[PDB]
């Protein structure tokens with residue numbers, strides 16, 4: 001299956017389902033796996049956002065805004 005090492009981001013053959021980008025500047029990022037506190041890697045951005053829905057992390061930080069990681073209530 002892995003002919004190469006998927007090291008090339010240019011192809012984006014892996015990012016298609018193994019990674020996502022910043023919803024603000026659209027820079028290739030990578031989920032940590034912790035408390036969902038995802039922050040941009042772009043030094044010209046560094047915006048913190050909810051990786052799950054790719055929305056603002058600020059309302060998600062126990063403020064009032066709830067989100068659905070893998071279990072949707074919808």
Ligand SMILES: [Zn+2]
Nearest residue numbers: 022025040045
């Ligand atoms: Zn960004």
Ligand SMILES: [Zn+2]
Nearest residue numbers: 050052053067
């Ligand atoms: Zn969210």
